[PDB]
From a paper:
Genome transcription and replication of influenza A virus (FluA), catalyzed by viral RNA polymerase (FluAPol), are delicately controlled across the virus life cycle. A switch from transcription to replication occurring at later stage of an infection is critical for progeny virion production and viral non-structural protein NS2 has been implicated in regulating the switch. In this study, we have solved the cryo-EM structure of FluAPol in complex with the viral NS2 protein in which NS2 is dimerized to stabilize the symmetric FluAPol dimers in a highly ordered barrel-like hexamer. Our structural and functional analyses show that the viral NS2 protein facilitates the switch from transcription to replication by affecting FluAPol dissociation from host Pol II and by promoting the transition of FluAPol from its transcriptase conformation into its replicase conformation.
We then applied cryo-electron microscopy (cryo-EM) to solve the structure of FluAPol in complex with NS2 at a global resolution of ~3.0 Å, using the large protein complex. In this structure, three NS2 domain-swapped dimers arrange three canonical FluAPol ‘dimers of heterotrimers’ into a symmetric barrel-like ‘hexamer of heterotrimers’ superstructure, with approximate dimensions of 251 Å × 247 Å × 184 Å. The complex formation is achieved by an elongated shape of the helix-bundle-like arrangement of NS2 binding simultaneously to two neighboring FluAPol units. The symmetric FluAPol dimer is organized into a similar conformation as previously seen in both human H3N2 and avian H5N1 FluAPol structures, with this symmetric architecture required for vRNA synthesis during replication of the viral genome. In the hexamer complex, the three symmetric FluAPol dimers were almost identical and could be well overlaid. In contrast, the three NS2 domain-swapped dimers showed almost the same conformation at one end but a significantly different conformation at the other end, mainly due to the flexible hinge region of NS2, which leads to the varied distance of adjacent FluAPol dimers. Thus, the FluAPol-NS2 hexamer lacks standard symmetry and might be dynamic. Cryo-EM density for the mid, Cap, 627 domains as well as the Cap-627 linker of PB2 was absent due to conformational flexibility. Previous studies of influenza virus polymerases have revealed that the C-terminal domain of PB2 exhibits a higher degree of flexibility in solution without the addition of capped-RNA and vRNA promoters, and the similar conformational flexibility of the PB2 C-terminus observed for the FluAPol-NS2 hexamer complex indicated that the polymerase should not be in the transcription state.
Numbering used by the authors:
A (entry chain C): 1 to 81, 88 to 248, 691 to 756
B (entry chain A): 183 to 716
C (entry chain B): 1 to 184, 207 to 226, 242 to 632, 657 to 671, 681 to 756
D (entry chain T): 5 to 121
E (entry chain S): 62 to 121
Write the structure that this text describes.
């Protein structure tokens, strides 16, 4: 309601109108970077000045019926002119407030939770003072996941986090990676944040390497403790310790009814064809498969048609 | 399209063929490129054709064979009798130009306020003031020789009166705004503002000069900066600094770092340079806050510091007063004027040349409890007019980095020494008491000191470098670093040599105009040179 | 006792305590750039160094130009910008011969970079001079203004989202007879020559907007060439430079059949910027791109052509005052070419009398030289060629030299059987460098026996390569919230330890200072403290009711557990196992009204924030409106075929229909949504 | 065993100061650190821990809490009734003071009992 | 009592490292003084390691 009304009056002004009309989706990221280039007016001093005044934080309406206006001492926690609140409200919430189960946290931040387990189950040796030479090679800071490349990691992330906004590939193949099943089953009712979950999943699932001047261990577990192991003239020894087949026929037809969403293709029929919205705006006509259409040796059998 | 190859592929079909790219000059760019060639060419295509068919036969040797022999780089040896002392300028003696005086300051202690007391600095200053009896009729003892001294007297009297007249108010204020008086207006320079008009109307006026493009004056070196440096390296009876805690250590390297930093902190905790750093930080922060808060008022800003006593009682000290003018700062270069008044016990009639921009008043008598009985000494007030900057307030708020720099220097020396004798040298440096370092001088010769003394010397050097910034320091440091490297190479039996030893020197003297700190550094370098090769 | 630290060098070697010579820790609070006075002196000096050139009058701009190429050979030791094309070409040919296959791989690697770069590449950098407002503006605003102006005149070719199309459109724009400037509603007319002049002016030096794209490709090619050479230490930084310093000494000290003498020299180059000439840069580019497609050659050759004919702006002007009427005024440099010289003093009068011939519309003409910065990695290759020329096969004599050379600093090592051979080698190296256009500073260079030298604040003793090239961290608050500053600080400390040579003792005190500053800034002291603030009561109430006091965060009364060994772990994960269950439930509640390796937490809040284009935030409105329909745009780049409005309408219709079907909202507003969508599509029909 | 320590240290010192090596100083330092570690362990030998005080009277000590609770409210009810019944002024004040004392002591003992367990 | 448990692990590491390096140094020496000193070194550290293990078992 609000978004469509805000879009309506944006069409009244022409200067924005050809911007909307002449810009394809693929060029959106080109537009997004025309914002600004000058903001750093001594941020530390600004923060110090803002922390001196009362009500420096912004919050939503509902905090009015979850936190009292005054505490036992007699100090105001929020004021009416989003509403303005003070850090005393945050401390009060940390002291008195509703409690919820935190069972999903270890399953999302597990890549951080493995580091402490590695560290506190460790032992140290002696330190040696000498001179040494450090060489360079490719080092893996994120090990990633085996049996998974960079192409399908993004596919898994999109399938798990944004099931309704996938299109073309992942929608026409006839398969299902195993890890997707467990990832969907475990996060059945996780309500932390889509973006945070996506970022953590990419961090713990996608591998990436860099260049470092390391003169010690090469494995990934020896990289995050590089600041503790090496030095200018000293060396410390340490051990870690421890979705069916679909094909598109064309664009939307006006004789086949309104288009439907990805999650509403489950019902379908035994061969009906219908319009569907896929990707970031595409609308195509699809209809399921009466055969296999696989990638087996048949593709090579075309060699029988040549070189007789 | 996801990987970034769709645009070029789409813009590559010209009917029924495929073309990689297209780019032509075809116009004004061609004409511009035409005269961007060596003088023996007219067209770009001819130059490209000539470049494409190039083979090197003998060009470099042939060109070298016909060059005159006066183009050369001859090496002259550097012997032990080669270097000469640096020449210092001559003229009238130099004067103090620091923001707050350092060696000649006292404090009016509040004597251990309550542990729950946290109030406005104005009330702390008032409570510090009420603890002194002995005010008298002030009178001038050293004229400023440029200005009006009765204005200074009236300013001091007005400060006293407006501090005393607080009680005539039904509501107690938080800050004090001074009444705009004629003497205060003259002191703050609010009537000496030139007027700006277009050049068209004033084209026919006379007696017009470009700007203050005058050659700087030349001044010599006095003997008070060395005294200040000597006093800045001593120990006091207070703490002046308290750092917070960190987690417990497990690894041996953590133990080594902990013992290193514990020794360093213990050696330089009670130094005077820490007091100077705290004073500067407090004063600059308070002045910046006052300037940013009130823009059209003459606010009174006290000078307040805090410390801990030996037995463990918190103490607050008051140094003087600062009156600020009008502050409408749009950029970081605009200047705001102020006047500063400070207490002292030092008689100005011993070194009149040191105080040239100050006005000195006698204001009272002080009772000293040293030894038995009570003896009275005069009390003096120093008044000066100044105005710094907006950037330099930020520069003065960061002086805790000098301790970090000194620790870095000490640790760098320790690591450099430990790299050769391949073991840990943190024990042979600190707890060993038979080791001495030469950091002194006397008519007898070169003296020696301990590790704490050199640590305090490095801290004082960093503080004084912070307090006396100038490009002359940068230039002198660079040239002296080069000369010191050459001398050290000479001392190692490596047969050094130079190509032009003079130009380095004339650079050294041309970076030696006025700053007393740079003159003291040059004298130190000369004193090092006279001993390094003898 | 009179104390002075310099005598401390009588016991400790200079390289061990050289860190006591640097006086400053950050940027000093003064400026030495100077205004119009310094630019005039720079122009006069760079024109005086090339007096014996050839004078020409431009046929497209009408500006005098000086050509010093192939001039008379120097006769004294003064700097001279008289270079020879044959010597440069021979040096490049010998460099190619020494390393076969070094110029084709770089071109092949650069070609794919050229064909894939997008227009956003120009949106980041330093400030840029704007030819439309005659001021300095951020890159994004200048780019937006340039696009708007170019569109207003029928030059619309950058919509393809390719940098090469933008360059093509810039070249097309430079060939028009009239330009229009609309300011919000003044309408100004610019002729051909004025626009050409304003398209070749350099700042006082950030470049313009029509030249950055051409410089970028040349810089990438130069970097690709430099990355394949061992004598260039510019791209690398850190321990790599230490290894590079070690390898040259190891190579030159093979001590096989030890009857040789080795001497090292540390040198600097004087008047580096105002002795280079873009014509030799063009020759080098032409030689490098042999047997290559012609369009690549044109793209790589455009930039030096523009650099060869450029204008330098003077500045703001002068300020005058009167001592009688208490009057002050400001005079600009635009009318400086006709003002009487009786006002100025002697030096300014001489400067004006010297500069008057080269003045057009307030900008001076400066052909022979490079203004400031830029083209560093190409001058680096030019210098490396002379070093490569020191092999045994090319000297055809007994002595031989090798070394390493940065953009301006250089270190060299010469081997000869006796002193005369060393002197001859040094003289030949000096003459060869002078023959190309490089002058060595005699008064700031020195030579000594191999074993100690210096290279860009890298001091090398017998085995120690300690460096002092960069400054200490800031250990201050970043200023986002109370959950990100801690992570930023610990990451900064760890990164400084890993890359630079920050000691372990230094890091602990830096952490102490950072924690003190954080506690002061965010008013979060320990519960068992007598400091009184507005936040003390709540902190003490929380502290009293907690049984495990070691699990509370520093943001609320908790203690500090950070040390060297745990600088790479988030605080929440560090204290997870030591806090109570109710505190955990309250802190990690995903239903808070308030909401670099950070956890969400309830401490991550947001503070209150306080011409050409009619509105400067027109792209941002559309961008922020997009994700309300497609929420995945904030995570990855969207892909599609249609416009934005089609997706808007389709998503809105689908969502409204599903909402009506599910019965969440009644039928009253469903028809309203359908009507507003119909109105939107009717408006789009126009 | 000690004489072995000094003999080894002296022999290695004579070996070292005649000709120096990295590892040689390394073993000297590691040996010395071990030497002091053994000395400190020996200093800790003749002290150990005080297990005699760790096994004091605690067997029957735990079970008297219920025994005390048995008569706590018994006596408090007796005091309440006798305060209600009495008529003098001395007895009333004495019983009121006793009641307040008993409330305080009962809280105190419950607080320590909860804290200790 | 908890700190001793974590210094003891480092003590074992130092013991084994110095044992192995002393044995390696003994392997390639050609001087009687060296050999005698190394004999005493190996014997002494064997005894010390045994005693440290006994105390480690006693402490728990």
């Amino acid at each position: 309601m609000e978004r469509i009304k805000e879009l309506r009056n944006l069409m009244s002004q022409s200067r924005t109108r050809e911007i909307l009309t002449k810009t394809t989706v693929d060029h959106m990221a080109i537009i997004k970077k025309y914002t600004s280039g000058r903001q750093e007016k001594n941020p530390s001093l600004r923060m110090k000045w803002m922390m001196a005044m009362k009500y420096p934080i912004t919050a939503d309406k509902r905090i009015t019926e979850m936190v009292p206006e005054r505490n036992e001492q007699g100090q105001t926690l929020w004021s009416k002119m989003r509403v303005m609140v003070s850090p005393l409200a945050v401390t009060w919430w940390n002291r008195n407030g509703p409690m919820t189960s935190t069972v999903h946290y270890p399953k999302v931040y597990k890549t951080y939770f493995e580091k402490v387990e590695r560290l506190k189950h460790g032992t140290f040796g002696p330190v040696h003072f000498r001179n040494q030479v450090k060489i360079r090679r490719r080092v893996d800071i994120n090990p990633g996941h085996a049996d998974l490349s960079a192409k399908e990691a993004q596919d898994v992330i999109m399938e798990v986090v944004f099931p309704n906004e996938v299109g073309a590939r992942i929608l026409t193949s006839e398969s299902q990676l195993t890890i997707t099943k467990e990832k969907k089953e475990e996060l059945q009712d996780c309500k932390i944040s889509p973006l945070m979950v996506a970022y953590m999943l990419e961090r713990e699932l996608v591998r990436k390497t860099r260049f470092l001047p390391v003169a010690g261990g090469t494995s990934s577990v020896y990289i995050e403790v590089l600041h503790l192991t090496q030095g200018t003239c000293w060396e410390q020894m340490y051990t870690p310790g421890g979705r069916r087949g679909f094909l598109i026929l064309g664009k939307e037809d006006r004789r086949y009814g309104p288009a439907l969403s990805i999650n509403e293709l489950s019902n379908l029929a035994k061969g009906e064809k219908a319009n569907v919205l896929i990707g970031q705006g595409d609308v195509v006509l699809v209809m399921k498969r009466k055969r296999d259409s696989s990638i087996l040796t048949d593709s090579q059998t075309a060699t029988k048609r040549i070189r007789m | 399209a996801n990987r970034g190859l769709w645009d070029s592929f789409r813009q590559s079909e010209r009917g029924e063929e495929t073309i990689e790219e297209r780019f032509e000059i075809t116009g004004t760019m061609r004409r511009l490129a035409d005269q961007s060639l060596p003088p023996n060419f007219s067209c770009l295509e001819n130059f490209r054709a000539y470049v494409d068919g190039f083979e090197p036969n003998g060009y470099i040797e042939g060109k070298l064979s016909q060059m005159s022999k006066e183009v050369n780089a001859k090496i002259e040896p550097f012997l032990k009798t080669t270097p000469r002392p640096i020449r210092l300028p001559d003229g009238p003696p130099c004067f103090q130009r620091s923001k707050f005086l350092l060696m000649d300051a006292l404090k009016l202690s509040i004597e251990d306020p309550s542990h729950e007391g946290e109030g406005i600095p104005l009330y702390d200053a008032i409570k510090c003031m009420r603890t002194f009896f002995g005010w008298k009729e002030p009178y001038i003892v050293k004229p400023h020789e440029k200005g009006i001294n009765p204005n200074y007297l009236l300013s001091w009297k007005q400060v006293l009166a407006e501090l005393q007249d607080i009680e005539n108010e039904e509501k107690i204020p938080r800050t004090k705004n001074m009444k705009k008086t004629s003497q205060l207006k003259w002191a703050l320079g609010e009537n000496m503002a030139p007027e700006k008009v277009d050049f068209d109307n004033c084209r026919d006026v006379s007696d017009l000069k470009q700007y203050d493009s005058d050659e700087p004056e030349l001044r010599s070196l006095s003997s008070w900066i060395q005294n200040e440096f000597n006093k800045a390296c001593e120990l006091t009876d207070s703490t002046w600094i308290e750092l917070d805690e960190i987690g417990e250590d497990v690894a041996p390297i953590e133990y080594i770092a902990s013992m290193r930093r514990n020794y360093f902190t213990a050696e330089v905790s009670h130094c005077r340079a820490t007091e100077y750093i705290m004073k500067g930080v407090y004063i600059n922060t308070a002045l910046l806050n006052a300037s940013c808060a009130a823009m059209d008022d003459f606010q009174l800003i006290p000078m307040i510091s805090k410390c801990r006593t030996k037995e463990g009682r918190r103490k607050t000290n008051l140094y003087g007063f600062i009156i600020k003018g009008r502050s409408h700062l749009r950029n970081d270069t605009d200047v705001v004027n102020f006047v500063s008044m400070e207490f002292s016990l030092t008689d100005p009639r011993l070194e009149p040349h040191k105080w040239e921009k100050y006005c000195v008043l006698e204001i009272g008598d002080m009772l000293l409890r040293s030894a038995i009985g009570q003896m009275s000494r005069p009390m003096f007030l120093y008044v000066r007019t100044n105005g710094t900057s907006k950037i330099k307030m930020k520069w003065g708020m960061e002086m805790r980095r000098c301790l970090l720099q000194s620790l870095q220097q000490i640790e760098s020396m320790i690591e450099a020494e430990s790299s050769v004798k391949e073991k840990d040298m943190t024990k042979e440096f600190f707890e060993n008491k038979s080791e001495t370092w030469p950091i002194g001088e006397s008519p007898k010769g070169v003296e020696d000191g301990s590790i704490g003394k050199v640590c305090r010397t490095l801290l004082a050097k960093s503080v004084f470098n912070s307090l006396y910034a100038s490009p002359q320091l940068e230039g002198f440091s660079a040239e002296s670093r080069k000369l010191l490297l050459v001398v050290q190479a000479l001392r190692d039996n490596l047969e050094p040599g130079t190509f032009d030893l003079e130009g380095l020197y004339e650079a050294i003297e041309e970076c030696l105009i006025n700053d007393p700190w740079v003159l003291l550094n040059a004298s130190w370098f000369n004193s090092f040179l006279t001993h390094a090769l003898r | 006792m009179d104390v002075n630290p310099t005598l401390l060098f009588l016991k400790v070697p200079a390289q061990n305590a050289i860190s006591t010579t640097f006086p400053y820790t950050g940027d000093p609070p003064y400026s030495h750039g100077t205004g119009t006075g310094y630019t005039m002196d720079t122009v006069n000096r760079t024109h005086q160094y090339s007096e014996k050139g050839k004078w020409t009058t431009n046929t497209e701009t009408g500006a005098p130009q000086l050509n010093p190429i192939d001039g008379p050979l120097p006769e004294d030791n003064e700097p001279s910008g008289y270079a020879q094309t044959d010597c440069v070409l021979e040096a490049m040919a010998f460099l190619e011969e020494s390393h076969p296959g070094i110029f084709e791989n770089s071109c092949l690697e650069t070609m794919e970079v050229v064909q894939q770069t997008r227009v956003d590449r120009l949106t980041q950098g330093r400030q840029t001079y704007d030819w439309t407002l005659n001021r300095n503006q951020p890159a994004a605003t200048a780019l937006a203004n340039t696009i708007e102006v170019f569109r207003s005149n029928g030059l619309t070719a950058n919509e393809s989202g390719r940098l090469i199309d933008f360059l093509k459109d810039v070249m097309e724009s430079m060939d028009k007879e009239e330009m229009e400037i609309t300011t919000h509603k003044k309408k100004q007319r610019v002729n051909k020559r004025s626009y050409l002049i304003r398209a070749l002016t350099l700042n006082t030096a950030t470049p313009g907007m029509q030249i950055r794209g051409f410089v970028y490709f040349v810089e990438t090619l130069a970097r690709s060439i430099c990355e394949k050479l061992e004598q260039s230490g510019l791209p690398v930084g850190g321990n790599e430079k230490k290894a590079k310093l070690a390898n040259v000494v190891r190579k030159m000290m093979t001590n096989s059949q030890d009857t040789e003498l080795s001497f090292t020299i540390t040198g600097d180059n004087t008047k580096w910027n105002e002795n280079q000439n873009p014509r030799m840069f063009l020759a080098m580019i032409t030689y490098i791109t042999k047997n290559q497609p012609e369009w690549f050659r044109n793209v790589l050759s455009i930039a030096p052509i523009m650099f060869s004919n450029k204008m330098a702006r003077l500045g703001k002007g002068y300020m005058f005052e009167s001592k009688s009427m208490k009057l002050r005024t400001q005079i600009p440099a635009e009318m400086l070419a006709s003002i009487d010289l009786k006002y100025f003093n002697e030096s300014t009068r001489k400067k004006i009398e010297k500069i008057r011939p080269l003045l057009i519309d307030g900008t001076a003409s400066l052909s022979p030289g490079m203004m400031m910065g830029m083209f560093n990695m190409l001058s680096t290759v030019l210098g490396v060629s002379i070093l490569n020329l020191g092999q045994k096969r090319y000297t055809k004599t007994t002595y031989w030299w090798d070394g390493l050379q940065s953009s301006d600093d250089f270190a060299l090592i010469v081997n000869a059987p006796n002193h005369e051979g060393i002197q001859a080698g040094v003289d030949r190296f000096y003459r060869t460098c002078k023959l190309v256009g490089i002058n060595m500073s005699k008064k700031k260079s020195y030579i000594n026996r191999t074993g100690t030298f210096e290279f860009t604040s890298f001091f090398y003793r017998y085995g120690f390569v300690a460096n002092f090239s960069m400054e200490l961290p800031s250990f201050g608050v970043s200023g986002i919230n109370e959950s990100a500053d801690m992570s930023i600080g610990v990451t900064v400390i760890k990164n400084n330890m890993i890359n630079n040579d920050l000691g372990p003792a230094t890091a602990q005190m830096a952490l102490q200072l950072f924690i003190k500053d954080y506690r002061y800034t965010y008013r979060c002291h320990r519960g068992d403290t007598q400091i009184q603030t507005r936040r003390s009561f709540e902190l003490k109430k929380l502290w009293e009711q907690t049984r495990s006091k070691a699990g509370l965060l520093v943001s609320d009364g908790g203690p500090n557990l950070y040390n060297i060994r745990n600088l790479h772990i988030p605080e929440v994960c560090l204290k997870w196992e030591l806090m109570d269950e109710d505190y955990q439930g309250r802190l990690c509640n995903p239903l808070n009204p308030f909401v670099y390796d950070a956890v969400a937490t309830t401490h991550s809040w947001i503070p209150k924030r306080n011409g050409i284009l009619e509105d400067e935030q027109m792209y941002q409105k559309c961008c922020n409106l997009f994700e309300k329909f497609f929420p995945s745009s904030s995570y990855r780049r969207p892909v599609g075929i249609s416009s934005m409005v089609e997706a808007m309408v389709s998503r809105a219709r689908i969502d409204a229909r599903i909402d009506f079907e599910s019965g969440r909202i009644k039928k009253e507003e469903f028809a309203e949504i359908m009507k507003i969508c119909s109105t939107i599509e009717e408006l789009r029909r126009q | 065993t000690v004489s072995s320590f000094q003999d080894i240290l002296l022999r290695m010192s004579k070996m070292q100061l005649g000709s120096s090596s990295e590892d040689l100083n390394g073993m000297i330092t590691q040996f010395e650190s071990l030497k002091l570690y053994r000395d400190s362990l020996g200093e800790a030998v003749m002290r150990m821990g005080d297990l005699h005080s760790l096994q004091n009277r605690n067997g029957k000590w735990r079970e008297q809490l219920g025994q005390k609770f048995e008569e706590i409210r018994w006596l408090i009810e007796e005091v309440r009734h006798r305060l209600k019944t009495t008529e003098n002024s001395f007895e009333q004040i004495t019983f009121m003071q006793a009641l307040q004392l008993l409330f305080e002591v009962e809280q105190e003992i419950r607080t320590f009992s909860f804290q200790l367990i």
